[model samples]
Target chain A: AKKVKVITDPEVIKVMLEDTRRKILKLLRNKEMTISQLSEILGKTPQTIYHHIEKLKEAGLVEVKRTEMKGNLVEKYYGRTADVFYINLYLGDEELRYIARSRLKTKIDIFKRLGYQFEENELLNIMDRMSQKEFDATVRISKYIEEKEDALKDFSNEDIIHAIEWLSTAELARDEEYLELLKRLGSILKR
Target chain B: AKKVKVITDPEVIKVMLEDTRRKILKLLRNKEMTISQLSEILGKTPQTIYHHIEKLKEAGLVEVKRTEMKGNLVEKYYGRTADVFYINLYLGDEELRYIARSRLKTKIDIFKRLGYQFEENELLNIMDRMSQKEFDATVRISKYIEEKEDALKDFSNEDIIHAIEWLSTAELARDEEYLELLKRLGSILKR
Candidate 1:
């Protein structure tokens, strides 16, 4: 199990972004290493090695395994905290805002492209007058779709193409209810 | 547009997680504040205020919007980076890894619950022998469902119920090749 770590700290993110620290983490993932050993292996000096180690240490990537004393000189050993690290795929403030904004933009674009501004409120209000079954159907389709998608991981490109072809075949596949629901979802957007 | 920020950075997450920083961001969203002003407003010492400010500044949440000259001293007025902040809604680390694992578990559970494991490779192999139309229909339904869902912004609850009802009325509504495709899509999961 890759059993990932979700990191949200900026300092850790900065530390993880470095090449040297990354290498240190990689090396440590297999076996603990001394500064001198790492210096010799990575072809860097003990001082530079020390610098990267400090960053890795701060970022929680590497930890002191133990220390050995040799002829009045002390050597430090380090090992990785885990086999793999994963930064949380969590979105940031500005980015998430943009996503929402862009969604609004896209919807407006759809209406603009269609050459009419649908009375969205009117359509919504009209639902109050429809039969319970019809209204409920209108309400539930989006959730059904969301559950199915969220139930699965990110779809493959092949999967996306498959979905589009599925929709194309849908013309033949759709029943009266399917068409009615589709129409209801889109009717308000009509010119 | 109430511009939203999607936070994926662990650093930002760590920053926003703090109550003081969150309140500071909320306040700054309306008007800029000097450290002293913030200290006065939040009932903390200017030193304590300064501590949170440095954090907010580094996290890219609160920034010095403009400086003002009050006597010989320059006051750095801090403002929020955005009006709204949203943590990236992405699943992370263990939960995310578990999600994939659980999908596997659910599939295996289904098989076990049904009383046998279809040799995993064997079922996949059988698909290869299916008629092109049948296989394509099977492939397309998930893709089709995905396409409709992904194509929309967040679906309202109404949309989801609608889809289920669409499926319900589908049998009576289905015509010709469309019914064939729907039947094919469902047949694979059957005992």
Candidate 2:
């Protein structure tokens, strides 16, 4: 079995993220299976399983592993393209902007639930105010990651994974630039 | 309109992540619409739209905005529960562990693509080796966020948002502990 599959296409990611497709992938990860076998295990109609399998095959996430002759019928077995799937979701500027607004709105919702009313314009204003900082943060992180490429190359595979996990989760909370930005934002929201 | 809706439940997140349901919510975000109206706009059968709307309503992500009478029919209009959705995916221990394996496998896949072969056991070993550090990094970041809570209280809401973005993306790369961990991992891999 292939060790990993890097899925970068957004459309393919959307296809793979669907509920039934995900289940099919997981079941196929360990062992290859024919449509009838999968259908029985999943308790879905063979046609339903076949539909999802066809979608998976079209997306290049699943492929035919082998074919067997059973009672004069050709039974095709399918398996996942890889043992692990790495989905790299490239969030563009517009998407990030939307997310920022979503985050801001989350705060607004909390206040609203507490019986506070806010002008929609004010919330939009906050998103507008924060968009630049968000962009800057993203660019700065990209640069940091780029700069570390050489250093990261020399690290053990295990250590490198640990380092990435660290970066993805905790490092940004303590960043100097980020803290400064937060202090600035706090000033804007304080009044 | 509510500003934000924080969705923490994994099941709810799964529901929101579905494609059709997401489209329904996005449409509802701007204006209230009856089932038929949504169906026509999305080029889906009213029955299909109704199925997704019911799922949304049950999840509290959609609600009846108002009822209008068109001829003799009572048309119930639906709207998104919140203007913005903040999906806080809380990655637990098992999920994080799985993600680490995924990340490690991503590297292995890259190597394999370049004609390198890896023992599955070796990759599993790396995950086991790094698991502790992963936990440590997580705990340290949690403590850091906790320690700063008091100081953070004085910051403007916008500043706080900036800080979070910073934390989520960049700060960890420069962290002293993180750097040390990377260095140690480098030594282990150098041999």
Candidate 3:
């Protein structure tokens, strides 16, 4: 089986978004399973499992891997199109903002643990400041990704992977503008 | 209300892990709710909601925010202890390995999106190499967090926040050994 699959189809992404469908896909990641097996694992009716699996099949995310003849009745086992899937799609600004807010709030908790106090206004001010900067950083990164989507054609396969991983990770830190923002944030908190 | 709360107590973490308790806490994040109010929203029996809320109260994650007098009886409202919570805890090596493997698989999907092909054996080999390095980097970063945790006391509150945020993000890239490891991985993949 292939190790990875990049799913960019919005139709497929929509299908994968359902809670039950996502859970079934997660279960199928380890091994192929018959419809009844999936139903048992998920505690759903066989017909419900059948309904979801058919949707998965239509989306091309799931397929029959094998069939077994059990006393004239046939049992079809289904497996994922890939062992790992990366859903490559642009998130809405609202979604990105939510993520940014959650991450910053997490850091706020850490700061509290480190013995920092936050008055209501001060906390709101810090969040507003950081959220604006963080959201901008995210949108900028998204633009960079879009611009460079196909730019690695000439690069070796390994180099392409490494470059993209770095871009998602340390690349944010490397942004000159972002570093300045961080420094300024420190200054704001210094008071 | 405080913007964030740090939850390091393992007992609280255990309570937070339950699906019902988590939902209650999430709902209470915005405003306070009565037991019957939570029951209606969650579509569960009042007994179930009461059971979970009591656990949350015992864990100190939920408390009575206010009370109101009705026609005949008093109504009590419960709310989360904080608007946001960060459960800081050490993960086991097995869990870390699982996370590292999952992350590497994610990268593999990205590589495929960039048009890289992987033979089965080659994929396995690359995964092992990357997983080892990534796992080691995670452990190293965790150690750094532990050692430098109290060292931030002298830092200004804002500086502490920014510093912790940076450590969790760009600091991994700044590690001399990790950078070297990335370089070597790239070289291996180049072939």
Candidate 4:
């Protein structure tokens, strides 16, 4: 079975922020591909593809899993180091912004190039319109997350997983001990 | 003090997906402004500002907080209905995708119309980057929040506030119970 890798360092994240590099990772996840194959598939030149692959290799996300020789020409086939990824929860806002902004750039570029038209009725499934109160709560929660996630904290991703995933399901469901835990979570839910 | 709002419904979330509309909301949060005032500040026309304000009003996010008469003309001043806004997460993948895609279009349009170059140095503050594993975890946590908040299951904003604000301060010193809570949080960290 392909195992999961825990990513806690920023160096690797920076490498993954590139759109072309990210797409390479996505393609490699399913099957190992040579840089030429990636270039053809992604519609970019081999030089551009090789540049991305080198960065991925540096981050330990991609590796030369195989090599082939056709008519004395060598081709390197690369695959993802892991089948799945998990990020450290302690990553700062700017780090997350880079990740999001990188992806956003790709979308922006595509629409700019293609003049795409998005689906008009995409939000039709939302039959349950938010109430004023619920809307208020949602905004508050988002604001809180924005505030709290801005600065890197002493906490690790593991600890955050423990709090939201583990403690939330606790049988105590708001025991006296739970109250304190809840309060701590609140302080971080800022804009 | 102005409190933040939770966004639960996609219908409402869609209202906020527009860059111009969001800018209007930001301005209104500070003080009620006339459409003409918003138009000048946002670099849009009165017609454009009015269109956005109506959409906000329809979503119950903005309202005609006051009305005034300047000479023979009746001017309506608008402001956000809440200090902060958020989205209710119970939306499905298609719904979220639709919202994201729709917003992406607007971003694409802005860049096309105004020729945007997202500040390349925006991520400079991030001295330490993250890994693919960490990125996955960050995305998962974000997905988890969207899912958990969507159904409005057993959670409430007040209770959420209490937990984040209160429980986080627990002097558990990484004790057994805290660890247990953390582990439980991991279990629910589903994709």
Candidate 5:
């Protein structure tokens, strides 16, 4: 193992922020899982799961715990390598701008995927209308959820099992407000 | 082209938080780059870059922008998929706790890699001493930088470039203070 800063790069940060990664991370929170197990749970193919696993390994986000038996064959058990994931505040303005621009690009990609199209200006306009407080509040809520791992450290394996059951049903909601903010902000930029 | 939420599973998040992913995302900030460009700039082999790129794409952190020429072959240009990445706030308490634990695990992994051996209690002790103020400051700084993105949108790219250069150098000088803060926080945990 090498000593490395956890939040040093924006690209890794981007990877850490994806929906698939989050789903996988959440599942691995309580126990280690094999790629096959993950694939079964995620409804993705083994190859697809393996691909994500490889990326997680490349990014230093996950590590192989040990080889385990799945009836007859040995399989790799994977676990998360971090207690938290966060933006590297140490990055300079240039870097920060890049991160911000990257973030905007993601939002735009998402909106486009949703079949909503807007000019760049229209996006900035929505961002401009958002109060700093609202934005920070949104971030806070997100982080609050992101950092909750420690609070349940003592739960029984049974508790985790049950929790996963309930959580699997929970709807993954989007922060539309944040997206709207981006749109407005983009619109403002156009002006 | 899918209605995907932008979060990753813990296992994937672990990979995303790795130094390799961080470097790749940081590099992508400059402009759309090919795997060869990333390999050249980062001093990694093309094979390694390709592996990491695959992971990034799997995580949905990077996307293909266009195909460009390289000698006789077509090389794909890849860019970040988002301007910002976030975790959903709607996770229940158990889910949040799991994330927190994963974060702590990551920190310990990094610390161990740095040749520091800390018992679980000792680690918790240090974390417990982290004043809300300290944590808040980090969050504050992150938001401040994020907000500046919109505020500076009107400035010419050249002006923005100069501003970034000036601010980056100033930040490097603050290394000592940050380290000192960490030392003090560590001491508090030791107590």
Candidate 6:
């Protein structure tokens, strides 16, 4: 068998991030799942799930681990091939741009879904607030703390992963402190 | 014009992470490139790029912004549709597992490409340095720094981004602290 490869291209990353495929992999993360199990959990047809599974298999992100009994017929069980995947952000600026564009899309999608409306300036203001430097700083600092915590696994702690989830859904607001911090970074970088 | 919707499902995310398509999207980030550009850059064919592009467009991760000259005929320029794309890691434990799996796949790819082989013990040792907690923290911190940088109109700092690019190609020992840091981060979150 050709060894499975890790994917890093943004185009491929975007495709992998599709709603159906992502959910499938997510489902498989807990345990090896058959097509039917995934379909039921995702509220999609088995056929639909199967189609995506085939695509994922071809990509090498997933694999058939084994087969199990289902009505006397052997059913294939699928699992994510690797314990983790990563995006090579430094490969090129294009990837970074894609990251930026994707984030903007997420912000817009959230506002639109919430039925929130604002004039262009108001929208920009909201964007400004949400995109404040301080907020990013806090996130960065929090992440640094998390990294430090990793070295001390002996210490029990709250699930930092859950904290990230909460932050992802948090509402965005502008803060003067964040704005000022951003200015300082910019100045330092400039100098 | 029909409004675009964001996909937040975990399954779709998995399928999109497949290899070739992600690569194509990453390439488009530098400039609005045509299929030929992508094919040439990625060393894949136009037909292959076209097929992936179709899938990406269907997934709402890519869109044809415009068409430009390609000697005789017009060629489409593809780009990411959103400024940000997010995978909701908070939905369930399964989601967290997938993230972990994805992180592993990413790390293996980097090490493999760099010709750095790790023993089972070495791999686990590196993993010890980077737990999910540390990985999440890195993402949060990087995003925070990026957001702050993006909000600056006058900031012309390309060096940090360049530094990132340099690290991607730099050769170092597996025992090197910097290399270890890169492996820990790359394997767990960012490749």
**In candidate 6, which residue ranges exceed 4 Å CA deviation?**
A1-191, B1-12, B69-72, B82-131, B142-150, B156-191
Scored by TM against the true chain B, the candidates give: 0.47, 0.53, 0.54, 0.53, 0.53, 0.53
Arrange candidates by lDDT, descending.
3, 2, 5, 1, 4, 6
| B95-132: candidate 5 lDDT, tens digit per residue | 54455555545544433432345575655434423322
Which one wins by TM-score: 4 or 6? 6
How accurate locally is residue B177 in candidate 4, as Cα lDDT from 0 to 100? 52
- Local error of candidate 2 at A122, Å? 13
TM-scores, all models, native as reference: 0.30, 0.35, 0.37, 0.32, 0.33, 0.34
* Cα misplacement distance, residue A166 of candidate 4 (Å): 24
Write candidate 5's Cα lDDT for A1-191 as tens digits. Answer: 11111364756666765657766765665457888867765678898889888888878888999998878888999988754444443244465555555544444443333234567455533322332323333333324333444444544333333232112111111234543443344333221
What residue runs in model 3 are displaced by over 4 Å at the alpha carbon? Answer: A89-167, A177-191, B1-191
lDDT of 2 by residue, A30-105 (tens): 4678888676556679999999998899989999999998887899989888655655443344554455566556
DockQ of the candidate models in sequence: 0.03, 0.03, 0.04, 0.01, 0.02, 0.02
Candidate 4, residues A1-191, lDDT tens digits: the string is 13335565677877775757867776565467888867755678998898889999999988999789956779998988865444432345476545544433333333222232343122111101111122223333223323343231433332333222212232222334443444332232221
What would the per-residue lDDT of candidate 3 be over residues A141-174, giving only the tens digit for each residue? Answer: 3344444556433444333434455333334344
The weakest ten consecutive residues by lDDT in model 3 chain B span B182-191
TM-score of chain A of 6: 0.53
lDDT of 6 by residue, A69-131 (tens): 888778899878753343333334575555644554444433333333434344434333434
Among the numbered candidates, top TM-score falls to: 3
Indicate the worst ten consecutive residues by lDDT in candidate 3 chain A.
A182-191
| DockQ, computed on Cα atoms, for candidate 3 | 0.04
Better of 2 and 5 by TM-score: 2
Error of 4 at A126 (Å): 40
Q: How well does candidate 1 match the true structure in TM-score terms?
A: 0.30
